[PDB]
Design a binder for this molecule. Structure first.
Ligand SMILES: [Mg+2]
Ligand SMILES: [Mg+2]
Ligand SMILES: [Mg+2]
Ligand SMILES: [Mg+2]
Ligand SMILES: [Mg+2]
Ligand SMILES: [Mg+2]
Ligand SMILES: [Mg+2]
Ligand SMILES: [Mg+2]
Ligand SMILES: [Mg+2]
Ligand SMILES: [Mg+2]
Ligand SMILES: [Mg+2]
Ligand SMILES: [Mg+2]
Ligand SMILES: [Mg+2]
Ligand SMILES: [Mg+2]
Ligand SMILES: [Mg+2]
Ligand SMILES: [Mg+2]
Ligand SMILES: [Mg+2]
Ligand SMILES: [Mg+2]
Ligand SMILES: [Mg+2]
Ligand SMILES: [Mg+2]
Ligand SMILES: [Mg+2]
Ligand SMILES: [Mg+2]
Ligand SMILES: [Mg+2]
Ligand SMILES: [Mg+2]
Ligand SMILES: [Mg+2]
Ligand SMILES: [Mg+2]
Ligand SMILES: [Mg+2]
Ligand SMILES: [Mg+2]
Ligand SMILES: [Mg+2]
Ligand SMILES: [Mg+2]
Ligand SMILES: [Mg+2]
Ligand SMILES: [Mg+2]
Ligand SMILES: [Mg+2]
Ligand SMILES: [Mg+2]
Ligand SMILES: [Mg+2]
Ligand SMILES: [Mg+2]
Ligand SMILES: [Mg+2]
Ligand SMILES: [Mg+2]
Ligand SMILES: [Mg+2]
Ligand SMILES: [Mg+2]
Ligand SMILES: [Mg+2]
Ligand SMILES: [Mg+2]
Ligand SMILES: [Mg+2]
Ligand SMILES: [Mg+2]
Ligand SMILES: [Mg+2]
Ligand SMILES: [Mg+2]
Ligand SMILES: [Mg+2]
Ligand SMILES: [Mg+2]
Ligand SMILES: [Mg+2]
Ligand SMILES: [Mg+2]
Ligand SMILES: [Mg+2]
Ligand SMILES: [Mg+2]
Ligand SMILES: [Mg+2]
Ligand SMILES: [Mg+2]
Ligand SMILES: [Mg+2]
Ligand SMILES: [Mg+2]
Ligand SMILES: [Mg+2]
Ligand SMILES: [Mg+2]
Ligand SMILES: [Mg+2]
Ligand SMILES: [Mg+2]
Ligand SMILES: [Mg+2]
Ligand SMILES: [Mg+2]
Ligand SMILES: [Mg+2]
Ligand SMILES: [Mg+2]
Ligand SMILES: [Mg+2]
Ligand SMILES: [Mg+2]
Ligand SMILES: [Mg+2]
Ligand SMILES: [Mg+2]
Ligand SMILES: [Mg+2]
Ligand SMILES: [Mg+2]
Ligand SMILES: [Mg+2]
Ligand SMILES: [Mg+2]
Lengths: 63, 386, 109, 183
RNA sequence: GUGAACAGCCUCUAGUUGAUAGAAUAAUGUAGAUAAGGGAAGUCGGCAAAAUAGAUCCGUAACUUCGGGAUAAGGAUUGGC
RNA sequence: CGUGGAGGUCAGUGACGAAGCCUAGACCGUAAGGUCGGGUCGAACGGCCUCUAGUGCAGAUCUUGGUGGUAGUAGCAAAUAUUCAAAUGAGAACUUUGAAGACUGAAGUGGGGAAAGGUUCCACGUCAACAGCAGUUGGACGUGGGUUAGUCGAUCCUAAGA
RNA sequence: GAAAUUGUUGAAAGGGAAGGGCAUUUGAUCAGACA
């Protein structure tokens, strides 16, 4: 099963780098059917794909 | 064309081939001349090398600038529990050299030896000697006549002994078995000695004593494949040289068009037979003697075992032989101590030593303390303790 | 026969990693553990819990803790029938300190 | 068909082939030979153990500068190896021979491998680039593999000639006398 | 961020995690380091290597086309709070 | 003595097996060679008189093709680095997803272009070859889809020069 | 569907090459001729 496409698609749709799209491993059968950006948009809207937080770079030691 | 400058060759052609020995137990190639006027005795002894330590003694050597002054000397300790006699072998002279004609064996053999006779003890039925043993049943008939036969013939008698490796901290259960030539009395007195000692046991003090010069036969430590520099003591080629530099630059002239037997080459180093001689006995210790490692002058009750015990060996709970300096072979290896082949009249040999102090601090680091007691005295109470 | 047991061991990773090249130390630890499981449970099939992976790599390649407290579970196998009926699953045990514990059986219920 | 020389009751044999197989011809030659004449069932368990590195395949021809292993002792050999890809192709054909045997209705308990022969398929060409702008060949050495399994059959009885005896006048007279004399 | 800095070293965003693999760690290598005492005796030759180094202050010779030579040479200092 | 072609002849051999090839089977010849048997084979071929020449190989660092020993050998070691589990699949060190450990460190292993390439882009299918291990993956293979301008370029202008 | 070269089977020889000459033993194999 090959979610490579849907992950790139995810990155583009959310506005984020692929390094941060989360493709949920228990919904792999559903994700794989998402050929379109419309179907990824629905997949993002309901949590089958999430944005994944930035890695903090605190400035507290600088400050 | 002719060297250029003259220099001695590297290393000794009389220790070739530099191959691994055929066995861990180096062979005794020679026994002391026989003098059948003295009482019958062993002429050598097995043990295991334990470790080394340091000694202090006054020197007796008129004319030396250290006459009557203390010296510190290195020494080795080899674990030496009694040996047990289990057989006799009788040799005869022939125009082809010495040949054995029979071996007579004790009736009971410890599993320790029996184990030597096997490669897979655990699986085996251990049937070794179980028919031999039955020969004793028949009154003794066939055993006497082999004994008889050794007496009638036999130019020399050697006895078959083995080590009590279980009285030793080693892990290797399988004992060491060997022929020691008997040297007192008539041939017949020898086999009488031998028969008498079957299943019975023999102690170093019955064979060695203080200040005696003895030899040590053992297999040298192993180092596996060694290049030419360190194996032969060859000179490192210069830093600029291509294709590497721990080598010999010229491996021979153009003629003979063959590499010669006498040039240095990479190959095995160590695990050699050696027969090292003239090691004075400094102590003949007794296993059943606290104050083993104590001295006339010291007096503190303590044994030779260092704090934490001999590194990589264990404890010594048996008699031992303390020998000046060092000996071939490593910690744990079987080792034949042999009686000297000549009476040495050296003055150096002859000197009668008396240890004033035996080091007993740990060898597992910079030992600061001889005993736990001394160490408590100095440190006082710690967070554990009382 | 079978047997189905859970125990908790502490493995000395320190003497097993002694000398090992820095970029193989956390990798060796995975193999070392696997080997440690087979030696106790007799089983050729050893799976490590992903958490145990994390515990192992918690400090990067060359910074493996000297002592891990493991829980090992011999389980029977199901599906496409394997070579052997049994297998072990290894888990981390959340302990304050993996220092000072002895091997211990875990009562099955 | 048309296999190599066989000497065997085809009524009691079965057989199999793979042509043009991309396995090393030399390694699978040594492993075929390791099996030649074996009780079928013994051989199969044996290849399985090879794969497990529990026993090895003796290398007897294609073997110079091979390594050494204690696992050659049972074959009286110091060089032996563990050719995975070879072993798996051979047991492939082997398992096939079995099937064909079951089909023919042959007793699977008597099966020994009575013929096993590998030789050279056409090589397949690839190339490698060498220093100073040069090209060299980089080639596969595939193998043809064929084997035959046969039901083992005991005995053989006797029966052959009778050696027609021919001897002169002086020779049959001594004989006539040997009886006239004794028994 | 450190810092004189688009240096080196560490990091966020993005992007990689591609380079046959496993097991051992003999000789000899390649690449990276260290060595008591001596200190170029090595060598065609100090080749290689080692030593030096930032900044603040002090202090700087022959000679000169008066511009230099000069960071001459030689010294001290330097963290944290 | 032997070979390719030619004139003559034997109303020559042959699909009931010509030629060719194989053969530590036979026989003739000092030899070049000739004859037979057996196996393989499938459409043509030979004896004798004579005519004719692109007419006889071991070599030429000969020509073209094929093939060995070398040898399962040299090697597949630059660019810090990999790990656990799931999923898929006949098959998973190498695919996908999750986790973790790291790297490039904005003078980028980021985001775009000029020249050059030309479909490599994208999707679905998919592994015989190819990607100096592998392969379910791919810039591979099969089948399709895809490049929209009054304002971005060309087009206009002039430069060295043609 | 030759040869080089290769696998299997069968037979034989092999103390630092192999192959060759004259001769015979031994094994295998075979023509002829007797009437
Ligand atoms: Mg001279
Ligand atoms: Mg030997
Ligand atoms: Mg006798
Ligand atoms: Mg060395
Ligand atoms: Mg020297
Ligand atoms: Mg030395
Ligand atoms: Mg050079
Ligand atoms: Mg030299
Ligand atoms: Mg020490
Ligand atoms: Mg080390
Ligand atoms: Mg074929
Ligand atoms: Mg060969
Ligand atoms: Mg070969
Ligand atoms: Mg080799
Ligand atoms: Mg060789
Ligand atoms: Mg061999
Ligand atoms: Mg190359
Ligand atoms: Mg080029
Ligand atoms: Mg007849
Ligand atoms: Mg008669
Ligand atoms: Mg990129
Ligand atoms: Mg590479
Ligand atoms: Mg690399
Ligand atoms: Mg490797
Ligand atoms: Mg020095
Ligand atoms: Mg100096
Ligand atoms: Mg000089
Ligand atoms: Mg000087
Ligand atoms: Mg000089
Ligand atoms: Mg010069
Ligand atoms: Mg000079
Ligand atoms: Mg330099
Ligand atoms: Mg220094
Ligand atoms: Mg100057
Ligand atoms: Mg200050
Ligand atoms: Mg002619
Ligand atoms: Mg002609
Ligand atoms: Mg012509
Ligand atoms: Mg024909
Ligand atoms: Mg022939
Ligand atoms: Mg004939
Ligand atoms: Mg015919
Ligand atoms: Mg036709
Ligand atoms: Mg003519
Ligand atoms: Mg011509
Ligand atoms: Mg010629
Ligand atoms: Mg030719
Ligand atoms: Mg030639
Ligand atoms: Mg010629
Ligand atoms: Mg040629
Ligand atoms: Mg060629
Ligand atoms: Mg290969
Ligand atoms: Mg190799
Ligand atoms: Mg290389
Ligand atoms: Mg990988
Ligand atoms: Mg970094
Ligand atoms: Mg930079
Ligand atoms: Mg890249
Ligand atoms: Mg672009
Ligand atoms: Mg292109
Ligand atoms: Mg693509
Ligand atoms: Mg394929
Ligand atoms: Mg390609
Ligand atoms: Mg490949
Ligand atoms: Mg492949
Ligand atoms: Mg295409
Ligand atoms: Mg297309
Ligand atoms: Mg415009
Ligand atoms: Mg226009
Ligand atoms: Mg054909
Ligand atoms: Mg001949
Ligand atoms: Mg002859």
């Amino acid at each position: 099963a090959n979610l490579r496409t849907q992950k790139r698609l995810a990155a583009s749709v959310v506005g984020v780098g692929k390094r941060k799209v989360w493709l949920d491993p228990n919904e792999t059968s559903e994700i794989a059917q998402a050929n379109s950006r419309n179907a990824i948009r629905k997949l993002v809207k309901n949590g089958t794909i999430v944005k994944k937080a930035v890695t903090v770079h605190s400035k507290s030691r600088t400050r | 064309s002719h060297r250029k400058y003259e220099a001695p060759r590297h290393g000794h052609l009389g220790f070739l081939p530099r191959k691994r020995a055929a066995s861990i137990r180096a062979r005794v190639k020679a026994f002391p001349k026989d003098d059948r006027s003295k009482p019958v005795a062993l002429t050598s002894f097995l043990g295991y090398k334990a470790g080394m330590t340091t000694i202090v003694r006054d020197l007796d050597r008129p004319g030396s600038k250290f006459h009557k002054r203390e010296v510190v000397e290195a020494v080795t300790v080899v674990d030496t529990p009694p040996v047990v006699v289990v057989g006799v072998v009788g040799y005869v002279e022939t125009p082809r050299g010495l040949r054995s004609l029979t071996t007579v064996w004790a009736e009971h053999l410890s599993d320790e030896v029996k184990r030597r006779f096997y490669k897979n003890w655990y699986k085996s039925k251990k049937k070794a000697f179980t028919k031999y043993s039955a020969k004793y049943a028949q009154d003794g008939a066939g055993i006497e006549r082999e004994l008889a036969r050794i007496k009638k013939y036999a130019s020399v008698v050697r006895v078959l002994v083995h080590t009590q490796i279980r009285k030793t901290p080693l892990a290797q259960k399988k004992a060491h078995l060997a022929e020691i030539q008997l040297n007192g009395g008539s041939i017949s007195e020898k086999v009488d000695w031998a028969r008498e000692h079957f299943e019975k046991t023999v102690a170093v003090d019955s064979v060695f004593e203080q200040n005696e010069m003895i030899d040590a036969i053992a297999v040298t430590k192993g180092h596996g494949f060694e290049g030419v520099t360190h194996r032969w003591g060859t000179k490192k080629l210069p830093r600029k040289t291509h294709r590497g530099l721990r080598k010999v630059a010229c491996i021979g002239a153009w003629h003979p068009a063959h590499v010669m037997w006498s040039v240095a080459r990479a190959g095995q180093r160590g695990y050699h037979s050696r027969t090292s001689i003239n090691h004075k006995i400094y102590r003949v210790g007794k296993g059943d003697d606290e104050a083993n490692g104590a001295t006339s002058f010291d007096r503190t009750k303590k044994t030779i075992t260092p704090m934490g015990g001999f590194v990589h060996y264990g404890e010594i709970k048996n008699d031992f032989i303390m020998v000046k300096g060092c000996i071939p072979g490593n910690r744990k290896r079987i080792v034949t101590l042999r009686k000297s082949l000549y009476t040495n009249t050296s003055r150096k040999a002859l000197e009668e030593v008396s240890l004033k102090w035996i080091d007993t601090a740990s060898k597992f680091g910079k030992g600061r303390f001889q005993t736990p007691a001394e160490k408590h005295a100095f440190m006082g109470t710690l967070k554990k303790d009382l | 026969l079978k047997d189905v047991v859970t125990r908790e061991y502490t493995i000395n990773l320190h003497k097993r990693l002694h000398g090992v090249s820095f970029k193989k130390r956390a990798p060796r630890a995975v193999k070392e553990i696997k080997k440690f499981a087979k030696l106790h449970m007799g089983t050729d099939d050893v799976r490590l819990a992903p958490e145990l992976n994390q515990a192992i790599w918690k400090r990067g390649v060359k910074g493996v803790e000297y002592r891990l407290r493991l829980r090992i579970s011999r389980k029977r196998n199901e599906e496409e029938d394997a070579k052997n009926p049994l297998f072990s699953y290894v888990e981390p045990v959340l302990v304050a300190s993996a220092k000072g514990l002895q091997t211990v059986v875990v009562e099955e219920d | 068909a048309r296999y190599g020389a066989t000497s065997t009751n085809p009524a009691k044999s079965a057989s199999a082939r793979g042509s043009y197989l991309r396995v090393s011809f030399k390694n699978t030659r040594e492993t075929a030979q390791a099996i030649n004449g074996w009780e079928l069932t013994k051989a199969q368990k044996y290849l399985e153990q090879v794969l497990d590195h529990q026993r090895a395949i003796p290398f007897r021809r294609f073997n110079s500068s091979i390594g050494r292993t204690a696992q050659g002792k049972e074959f009286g050999v110091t060089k032996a190896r563990w050719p995975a890809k070879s072993v798996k192709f051979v047991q492939g054909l082997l398992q096939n021979a079995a099937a064909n045997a079951e089909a023919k209705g042959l007793d699977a308990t008597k099966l020994y491998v009575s013929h096993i022969q590998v030789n050279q398929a056409p090589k397949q060409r690839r190339r490698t680039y060498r220093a100073h702008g040069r090209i060299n060949k980089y080639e596969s050495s595939p193998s043809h593999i064929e084997l035959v399994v046969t039901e083992k059959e005991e005995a053989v009885a006797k029966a052959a000639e009778k050696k027609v005896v021919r001897l002169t006048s002086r020779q049959r007279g001594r004989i006539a006398a040997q009886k006239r004399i004794a028994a």
